[PDB]
Amino acid sequence: NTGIVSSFFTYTGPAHGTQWDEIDIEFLGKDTTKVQFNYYTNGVGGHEKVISLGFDASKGFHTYAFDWQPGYIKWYVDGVLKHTATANIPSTPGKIMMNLWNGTDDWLGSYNGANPLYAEYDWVKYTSNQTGGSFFEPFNSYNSGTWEKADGYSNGGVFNCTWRANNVNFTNDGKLKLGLTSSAYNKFDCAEYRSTNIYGYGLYEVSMKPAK
Numbered sequence: 001n002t003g004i005v006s007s008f009f010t011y012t013g014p015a016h017g018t019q020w021d022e023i024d025i026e027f028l029g030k031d032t033t034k035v036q037f038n039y040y041t042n043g044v045g046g047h048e049k050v051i052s053l054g055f056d057a058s059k060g061f062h063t064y065a066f067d068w069q070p071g072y073i074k075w076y077v078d079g080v081l082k083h084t085a086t087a088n089i090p091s092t093p094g095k096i097m098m099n100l101w102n103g104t105d106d107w108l109g110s111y112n113g114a115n116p117l118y119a120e121y122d123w124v125k126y127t128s129n130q131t132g133g134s135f136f137e138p139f140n141s142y143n144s145g146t147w148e149k150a151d152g153y154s155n156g157g158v159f160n161c162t163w164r165a166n167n168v169n170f171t172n173d174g175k176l177k178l179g180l181t182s183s184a185y186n187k188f189d190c191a192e193y194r195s196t197n198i199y200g201y202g203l204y205e206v207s208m209k210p211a212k
């Protein structure tokens with residue numbers, strides 16, 4: 001069922017001592033000509049919207065964004081509005097997170113570990129509703145002041161891989177590359193990179209290329 005997923009999302013929930021509020025951009029590796037938008041408010045999801053892109057997202061970098069305001073979320077693809085939600089919008093500030101992971105599946109028919117799956121992200125921009133809360137991250141190198149790598153555990157549940165910090169790497173030309181690897185025992189190691197601060201309403205933009 002759930003195969004390979006590359007994502008850009010905001011998150012907060014009970015490990016952070018709050019209700020689960022989250023806004024998603026996710027790409028399923030089974031069809032990268034589409035993108036899926038969704039969000040959870042107080043743990044309630046069921047807002048999936050799948051958009052056809054008109055291009056195969058895995059072939060180049062595109063800019064995806066969501067503008068999260070008190071009364072709506074609006075999602076954009078390369079500056080073009082694609083979807084607006086207005087119902088039960090979330091309101092708790094969260095961390096910005098990016099991951100690549102496999103669920104518990106037919107993507108294994110083509111998976112070859114000598115040319116592993118990688119999701120690449122060239123930059124992230126957050127333009128805050130609160131003056132002085134904006135930031136730009138170009139992914140030239142690991143910045144321990146603003147981000148952390150997930151390592152040493154699995155989320156469990158739908159996730160069928162263990163986060164490894166050594167699957168989070170930076171290329172010499174400035175991209176964050178998250179990899180999904182398997183060396184034996186049908187065990188996969190995957191990767192998540194996440195901010196250390198939390199952010200609220202504003203425009204979140206990412207330039208990325210999902211795995212396939």
Ligand SMILES: [Ca+2]
Nearest residue numbers: 122123138174
């Ligand atoms: Ca960059």
